[model samples]
Target: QNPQQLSSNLWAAVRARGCQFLGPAMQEEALKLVLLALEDGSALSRKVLVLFVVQRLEPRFPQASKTSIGHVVQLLYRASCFKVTKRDEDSSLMQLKEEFRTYEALRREHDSQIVQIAMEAGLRIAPDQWSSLLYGDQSHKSHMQSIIDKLQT
Candidate 1:
């Protein structure tokens, strides 16, 4: 199936069964498909869904392979580095809010492994990229400093 169709199907399956849809036997294949869809850069929805799935799966499967962890780190790093424009402040703010919600959820997640991965990736990427979601153009330096302080504890 085409990557687009696969992405749609995977999203549906994940919505229906959470990560269990990709059982142990199918997890690797599913991860590969999701990563491919993420790299396709076809649609924002596809990337968001794929990232959500990864966020759900990684914590439950903390014993995931090294390759899986590396890929996830790469994906998160790329996401943290994504650029947004002020061409449409309203739309951009809305999108940023949604992305912030996702990041906040991940940050406060009960799974230390997932939080640690996100924190590390966030640190490696531009701090402003992630902090902007928290403080926008106002006090981003302090916002980032607080984030780092929390992560260090």
Candidate 2:
């Protein structure tokens, strides 16, 4: 719902929290904001933004289908996901992501899952790129923001 309110929550939390986790409220706020950007744009603009954003993440492969675009949203969702762990002031022990080893197993069993959708969508990417997305160093928000920044820079 009220992303306005939640964005306010995220803003304050980011100011106070910094490198620490912001709990679920601001966590979900960023989630919705990322989804909102993906949803509120046109298919063509979505193509540019989606492909641009993902390529920065190191690559969306596209479709004329909105469901395909929706699948890209879910891919961003999954890639951006992480459950917060304890605080350590920007330490590595602070978050959790699904293991690609496990993810590979899951994708092995089902074609209807997010991993499958991502694989179907990211035909341009190799397993290394996919591995990097799951375990890479870039943040999509800053990546997207930095993209526009450099474009105008």
Candidate 3:
């Protein structure tokens, strides 16, 4: 399906279905579609895509162990930060921040290895972006600090 054609509700249903049933090849395709959807979708859509990735696809899909998954996660993280910094929207930023918190909680509870793979990728793929988030402006600093601090340890 063309990502553009799907309503946000439909897109989310599809995402859930893909997470529940898709194989590696199909999951990869789903990831591609989700990424495209993120480009034009609303904050809600972006939130769903991020959740699908961090919550479902990353842990279940073996391919997610690869470094590319880290790059994708980093891109999503960077975009979330950019939205907060550029738009200065409190609700959306709070939602994004909350999502990362959930990600960390899930990581601690269920998937430390995968989380480490993603962190390794983050360290390798976007160290500067990570640094900026850690040591940049006061506004951008607090939200991502927990994740950055986790990566350090």
Best candidate (score: TM-score)? 3
TM-score of each: 0.22, 0.18, 0.24
Candidate 2 deviant stretches above 4 angstroms: 1-49, 52-67, 75-96, 101-103, 109-153
| Among all candidates shown, the one with the greatest lDDT | 1
Q: Which 10 successive residues of model 1 have the least lDDT summed?
A: 91-100
In the range 1-153, model 2's lDDT, one tens digit per residue, is 333454344334323322222232332332333333333322233334434344333222221233333343443334443233444664322121343213332222221232333333332223333233333434333433332344334
Cα lDDT for residue 34, model 3?
45
Q: Tens digits of per-residue lDDT for model 3 on 1-97?
A: 3223322333233233221213335334434544443444334434445565555555455555333443444434433422442344543431234
In Å, residue 51's CA in model 3 sits off its true spot by: 1.3
Candidate 1: tens digits of C-alpha lDDT, residues 94-145: 0222332343333322122322444443323234543433233534555455
Displacement of the residue 152 alpha carbon in candidate 3, Å: 37
Ranking by TM-score: 3, 1, 2
Which is better, 1 or 3, measured by lDDT?
A: 1
Clashing pairs in 2: 54-59, 55-59
lDDT of each: 0.39, 0.33, 0.38
